[model samples]
Target: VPKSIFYNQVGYLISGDKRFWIQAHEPQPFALRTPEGQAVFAGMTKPVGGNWYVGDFTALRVPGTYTLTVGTLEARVVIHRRAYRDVLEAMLRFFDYQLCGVVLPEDEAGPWAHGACHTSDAKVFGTERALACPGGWHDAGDYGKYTVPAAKAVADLLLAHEYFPAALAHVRPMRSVHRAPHLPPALEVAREEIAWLLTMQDPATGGVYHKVTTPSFPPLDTRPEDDDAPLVLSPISYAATATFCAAMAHAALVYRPFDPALSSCCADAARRAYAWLGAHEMQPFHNPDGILTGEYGDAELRDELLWASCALLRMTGDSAWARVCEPLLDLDLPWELGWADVALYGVMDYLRTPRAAVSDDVRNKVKSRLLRELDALAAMAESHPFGIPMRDDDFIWGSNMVLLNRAMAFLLAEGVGVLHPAAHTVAQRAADYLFGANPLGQCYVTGFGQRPVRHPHHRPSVADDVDHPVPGMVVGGPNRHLQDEIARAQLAGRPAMEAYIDHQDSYSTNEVAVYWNSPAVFVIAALLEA
Candidate 1:
């Protein structure tokens, strides 16, 4: 029988908001009972919207597994003090699993172990120059390493470490794969990408290469090490250079306390990259013939320039850079955490800088604008059936990332003193929905919960014969656009939230990426800390 009751399959915090939704027209009676049929709490379902009656059992704070019964439906739920700990660990380790050019030992990576891959040197496009760019997580389902999205991934991890070090202290990444004297889990995993990014910058010009990949995507079943096609470095662009400058500046500050050498190197590289931005026009990158992979192209480069300026100002604390950043901040750019629209990262950078360094009036205006944005998101969460900050139209490709980034915005506000009452509630709701509380009862993560994603469109998982995909990977969930053939054929006419298939061929809906998991790590850390 199909389950009438949909709830978080990954358990809940002992003292958290607990709600289970059932499809019904009227209020239904629900009970929380022990395994032996001892009723602990009872409640009447309240209508949240069309056919969705939500039963709240938040009062049951005892830490134990319980049976939740609503009429003919029964679901097992667990309540724990640290409900998200294991899943957080899995999500953080997803970065380690995506590592390129590293031997994932059997002890650390388990069944997903693989040899060093993409070690070959890449030739510069339209030139004879060859550069060795070996590390960084593969960009999404494909085996490419893109600079634009890579910066977003690196920024999110660094921010996670800065905001919640204590919460992340409990988790461990692949220990054997990283350096001997390890930093925290987030820093350790991100260092490999940071090192690779440093390699992407041009020594003479200070500009950074956009990406390095084979001419085209390899066969779906090709293993990482097996795809030995010649790699080519795409031409450097303004967007890539600007984003790289921002990420390097952020990394320089975050790693300063632990790794002074890397910190100093990153600081210098950021300055050089910023100088490169000064000389170049804000031109978008187009694939120079025969290079057909993901083109993270954007005509509007002002947001990229704004993020670079704001990041440099924060890194140096020299008010001289404020002249450059303040004007960019005043521009009407969309504030978002995605790779495309990244003004929020810039906004946070500017707002978090020491108050004395920036204009008081501008800072207040920026803070006010941010609060208003959060208020609008909170309003969306208030009206949604699942209590998430989303609507039907928001469920595009990487919809899980869109949801996580909104939750991240709420938490990011708390750090900058732009606190909202609905911040923590929205984070919990986002986690709940990601873990299987949605209408489809699907856990967006790969290797946990009652109904987990088994066939993610990741290359390693598909190439390997292992029964389960790499643990901790978060797939791009429920893309209503049906960008891929599999999704178009199978998911047509379904609701936005239901427009998902757990097939390896559903690239738009099932592919995994570092940027997608980065915000997840941030949001989950916030929940655990709260």
Candidate 2:
């Protein structure tokens, strides 16, 4: 390859043309080697800045991998009919891989499958007693369950299916999953977590619990069988409840046509939760019983209220629901997405809704703002040294996901058709960079790309003595502003992008998360689309 394609998008070419960025102190000769070992010495393109030279190469009609050579440096890439099928499938396997308490289905079970564990659980909150809180996938490297991120995970999957449709519709889950023939393929995956979520709802008050967890994290080497800690329903939090409503409303829309029973169930839960939010107003949730595992506390629920209202409006299509949409329209786009920062959810819902149903004010204000922000992102990413949208400052705790979020917004742009030609190009470059085109020459995803994390800081992978480290995981990539003692000692002063280590000790970098992988799966699947 004469230059690097944006992101790791070099795998296949639906478009017959590709661009690359090569590093050189001055003008230099370069060539791209075809799979047949045929070399074309067009060299690198004109310099964009510094040693970075950009060039465009008209690709061949044939589908296969190609190598780019700049002097002695070479990069490998695959070009097929469409890229990322296995990558998408592999990431879906992540939910299966994270399955907790449920028996591993005989079909499609990974090699890491084990007997049902954590079946014996107790309530760690409220009055403190025994309760069966089973079935949600583990949220991250840690085995605790939290409401916001898990609900966010399902919401991402639902939105991915909604936006890209067949991208997720084609994924094959275990036989034990939904088993509902008419439902979307990923719904089975979403329903597993939704089942657990319904359990966390306070039946008496219609509010949702903040989290279900042991008093403290289990031992690092602790097996599921050995995690015999008391389980507790943490105090009811309004934020978690509304987030639950947000996810449920989305689920209701997806299921309404396919599984009417599930659809009605979800809609009823969402409507009741919405009424509960009104009654409770500003009653914030705390680790009420002095238990904690990742507080997703928000000072205000206006963003959530806006998000839930917009979701309900779409799910029901009643104009009355849109009344609440106006209030949350001005909430800022969350710069970095996570549990508590969810204004983007509402922004996206109203913007993506059918034009006839949306008010002109929203289209002008809500949709207009997002398009400008997206245009700015494409321009910013094109000028970056890494040839991707992310910056040195982007190397936060789970920086890899930050890129995925940008990838998400760019794909959403496809619907609006606002930023064309240039917008699509920058988005492709971002995906290509994550594969192996970056400063590190490593793919951030495990078991899917050119170079993957072998020692992801997952409990089962670390303690189960697995040889391959539970296939198909995406590690938390590059956090140079080290948060933990391990990262402080090991990753300090490194270039932010190169801050990752392939060791179980760097939990800050190598920890696997459902929230991270689900969106990455969403984007990769979207990229695979024709």
Off by over 4 Å in 2: 1-10, 14-22, 34-36, 54-58, 105-107, 176-182, 281-292, 332-337, 354-358, 416-421
lDDT of 1 by residue, 1-530 (tens): 14667888888898788988888889988999999999999999999995678999999999999999998999999999988899999998988888899899999988999999999999999999999999888988789999999999999999999999888999999988898798988999899999999999999999999999999999889899999999999999999999999999999999999999999999999999999999989999998899999899888899999999999899999899889989988888989996888999999999889999999999989999999999999999988999999999999999999999999998998889998999988998998899988888998999888899999998899999994898888889999999999999999999899999999999999999999999999999998887
TM-score of each: 0.99, 0.91
Q: What is the C-alpha lDDT of each candidate?
A: 0.92, 0.73
RMSD of each: 1.0, 3.0
Model 1, TM vs. native: 0.99
Stretches > 4 Å off in candidate 1: none
lDDT of candidate 2 over 384-443, digit per residue (tens) = 765567778888888877877777777766766555455455556656666665666567
Best-matching candidate per TM-score = 1
Give me the displacement of residue 339 in model 1, in angstroms: 1.1
Q: How far is candidate 1 from the true structure (C-alpha RMSD, Å)?
A: 1.0
**Which candidate number has the best lDDT?**
1
